[PDB]
């Protein structure tokens, strides 16, 4: 489940599918277990909401059309990707994920609107 | 070259948070009938595998005393147990004037239990009948406003009403595997010298926890697991004497208890249909209920706990003392055994001391020395304080034995004074949170956050 | 949530992502609240069913290979799109949405079958 | 619902969308009906997990980059396709679906990593 | 008074056999055997499906 934990980002770039797959378990005993069985289903569809509305239909290595403002890390790509592991990373860049989500929203919606500029041209 | 933000899914990222938890049961309850006991019918079936998945480069914090899982299991056990007693008789027709026993034999030169008789609402409402039974002494109270000893009462009828645990259920500690719902991970601390707070440098993950024993026990943790290497000691902070101090043992001390009175079952009936059980005549000659521990084992283990206390108190030597007073539930070791509820005086296990000098106790010169604890018996269990308390444990026929292993001692540093250089420790009371927490320090449940963000040299098409 | 309500179609063409995002709330009290917690999750997956089977994987501005039969509106594109708003439009076009769903179903499935005609050609 | 059942594979290649659509019914009476109302929603999202992680975002006729090892059937394409109906096929091919799932997982993830190989070039 | 206790069926309820349609939740199919002399085991050669029984 968590073999990529701790290791560097490049090493962690694979086995992501194993980490995504594990959202299934159990049988019902009463209301509280049924509350556990609505489970991360709301969480899973919340992630699906976020990634689909960012144009990333399906779960993948989705890169975007928003440039990376260096003020979020101010660290080189190579020193980060080869050496850093995601935990302190998620702790640090938590200062910026929200405006990043907003930028992804507006960029994806603007790009989708621009599809009509070509999709009405053909 | 320019950089664009790239979102990664399937990341390992953690956040400690509260969450509902399954209950999963081992195989040793699925052979019974449904609901005999809950583990056979409600909790999901287990799986022995996967084992602990080692993690190469992890570094995780482990605060154990604030671990929510104790509360998520305290409320679980209170809700589960209090639902198990629902269908059984709610006694109520026993709060009756008990007019009973003749003179005691030889003024207490005997291991006494008291006989009493009483009027019951028989199968016809208004044609009540006389009946006789016997009870152990803690469950009878004098009634009369005067000195008169003729009339007696159950110890209830001043507290809340009661119910009888049905003969169908069993109290054996069927183990319970805790398993987090999908989307959460159980992280296991694996630092062999982990005290209870700070980090664990070697950490793993499991799908479901290995089975815990839910056994109720105050002063000694019966049938527990074992420390892998050595005796270890835990507290939220040793400076606070009021805090419970847990001790966990590597070598298991073997404890055997028995109640050799050949108590016999009797079946009174109450109103329509529903029976009520009580002790009939004892066949045989009565004898005290007691618990036995091997003396050399206890001496060696207590001295080793002495050195482990000296690891935190090298300035001072160690003594052990009797319990800190209070009522019956708090003073005495109380643990369940085959159907009864034993209560045992613990003085004879906490009268030694240690002053640096480890004596040549082992290997055994003569293994015949064994200490003995005098033990009382109860049926009216004021089980948890203010819960809907009094369960009536039905009396169980035939003589019983509960040969078991001790694995942990709950103690309290004395609330004394005078700057004693040989500070002394008493047995603690048991909050069952603390009993259960001692066997659950190894686990922590963490929220999985599989959405990721990072830079990468990409630019999608337009 | 609903800033686009009332305004004309073209003005309402943006902030769609905001109105799509809002499908999350609450904490459980008993069976009835848990019934509220299965929520529009069933509705959300119904919409996912409809739009995915119409080839629109990931909610977007999806235009299809079904010609717009003018009998459904018999109104020019510009007069509708610049001036009308979606409420009375939905009230009127309710006479035709069902056969439209059928046409979308058959058109998409026919197109997907025709993928094999090229996807088995390469 | 099941018009394609029994008939051969080629005839069954259509009306698949009808069989995909039917995952909706009911109103709540207590815990057990609510347990029925979490329904195949877990099954539906399990299928979504499987087919989305295999790159098939939005259920379709999805062919993959894994060659068909003939040891799984050792039967010609035409004889299977024009004549066989799926039930005994699923009974027989059950001996191989699991390693097929593994192969689809690794093949799709390797292909997805190669998106960065190409798309870092632009 | 020798067996368990009792309760009185209220006058509000009725014992008339109101019919019940068994219906499977979405994702499952009710299959009906239609062989006019199906004895009770073995195959049924003519079979259908229904939304609810
Ligand atoms: C806990 O405490 C409770 C009480 O709080 C104890 O339970 C009670 O104990 C009482 C004392 O033992 C016992 O009382 C009995 O009364 C019987 C009389 O019954 C009457 O009522 C019934 C009901 O309506 C009528 O049907 C019946 O006809 C009577 O009117 C006595 O019979 C009992 O005594 C017998 O045993 C003792 C020995 O212990 C003898 O000394 C005595 O004589 C009785 O034995 C004769 O009778 C039996 C038949 O019962 C004959 O089979 C036997 O041979 C004896 O015969 C004599 O007579 C013949 C000629 O007929 C003669 O030739 C021969 O030599 C004999 O002399 C007893 O006294 C209560 O019933 C009981 N409670 C209940 C609910 O039962 C309980 O024990 C305590 N427990 C403990 C562990 O401490
Ligand atoms: C009720 O009380 C009685 C009397 O106290 C009690 O019976 C005794 O139990 C002990 C329990 O240990 C018995 O101890 C023996 O210990 C020897 C070791 O010296 C063992 O080898 C014995 O067991 C094995 O060997 C037996 C053949 O010799 C086998 O039949 C047995 O299955 C084992 O393989 C044995 O345990 C002691 O012998 C008995 N009897 C007496 C007279 O003491 C009884 O157990 C109590 N009831 C309950 C339910 O505990």
Residue numbers in the entry:
A (entry chain B), C (entry chain G), D (entry chain L): 522 to 547, 569 to 664
B (entry chain A): 32 to 139, 150 to 185, 185A, 185B, 186 to 309, 312 to 321, 321C, 322 to 354, ...
E (entry chain K): 196 to 248
Quoted from the paper:
The HIV-1 Env is a trimer of gp120-gp41 heterodimers that are heavily shielded from the host immune systems by N-linked glycosylation and further protected from neutralization by conformational masking and considerable sequence variability. A glycosylated region near the base of the third variable loop (V3) of HIV-1 Env forms a supersite of vulnerability that is targeted by antibodies originating from diverse germline genes in multiple HIV-1 infected individuals. Here, we determine structures of antibodies in complex with HIV-1 Envelope for all observed members and ancestral states of the broadly neutralizing HIV-1 V3-glycan targeting DH270 antibody clonal B cell lineage. Here we used cryo-EM to visualize the interactions of a complete inferred DH270 clonal tree with the co-evolving virus Env.
